[PDB]
Amino acid sequence: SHMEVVNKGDYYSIQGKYDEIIVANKHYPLSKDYNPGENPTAKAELVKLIKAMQEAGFPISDHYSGFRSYETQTKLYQDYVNQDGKEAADRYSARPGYSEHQTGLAFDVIGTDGDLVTEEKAAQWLLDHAADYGFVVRYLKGKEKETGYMAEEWHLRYVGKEAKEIAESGLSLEEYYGFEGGDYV
Amino acid sequence: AXKX
Ligand SMILES: [Mg+2]
Ligand SMILES: [Zn+2]
Ligand SMILES: [Zn+2]
Ligand SMILES: [Zn+2]
């Protein structure tokens, strides 16, 4: 079953159960020019999700950290490095050409905040119902050695129909699909 | 922290 990854040029991808699954992480970088914008299918699903969360009573904004280009990433990374250094920045912020946001398939929900109890309720809601809309929480709790990054409640990755199966496993995409993760080089 |  373990399928090896296929280079499409600008990006690597692996053939999922129903769809082609683009792979972007510290081990699998994207090209510099790759500037797709946001995915219109994923975009339409996130919008539905946000309304479900808002109508559920959670303070969730109408805007989100969706697509980020290489260029945007270059300026975003170095600022976080300035803030905490390089060893601490690398734990939650990808280098230019390694960010899932560059694919157009990854979006960070914004909460506006901040009751804490309300945040964690919202974070659990995602875990329980993000698959319904083809999304998965990418950077799960206690999976930093596999994914490369520490846990992040708000970063969703559109995978589509297989989101439910992936969530039920409790695995990272690296573990589930069996492609490499970890650190750089 | 925490964006990857
Ligand atoms: Mg941009
Ligand atoms: Zn392999
Ligand atoms: Zn290219
Ligand atoms: Zn993110």
Numbering used by the authors:
A (entry chain A): -3 to -1, 56 to 237
B (entry chain H): 2 to 5
Article sentences:
Despite attempting to crystallise LdcB enzymes with a range of synthetic ligands, one crystal structure was obtained, that of SpLdcB in complex with MurNAc—L-Ala—D-γ-Gln—L-Lys—(D-Asn). This ligand is a close chemical analog of the true reaction product, as it contains half of the repeating unit of the glycan component of PG and comprises a tripeptide stem peptide that is branched at the L-lysine, the location of the crosslink position in natural PG. There are six molecules of SpLdcB in this crystallographic asymmetric unit, though none of the interfaces represent a stable multimeric form. Residual electron density was retained throughout refinement in only one of the five molecules, chain A, into which MurNAc—L-Ala—D-γ-Gln—L-Lys—(D-Asn) could be built and refined unambiguously. First, the MurNAc moiety is situated at the very top of the intersubdomain cavity and makes little contact with the protein. As expected of a reaction product complex, the lysine carboxylate is located adjacent to the active site zinc in subsite S1. Most of these residues (Asp167 to Glu171) move by 10–15 Å in the presence of ligand to open up the cleft by refolding into an additional turn at the N terminus of α-helix 4.
The enzymes are active against bacterial cell wall tetrapeptides and adopt a zinc-carboxypeptidase fold characteristic of the LAS superfamily. The LdcB enzymes are single domain proteins comprising two subdomains separated by a V-shaped cleft.
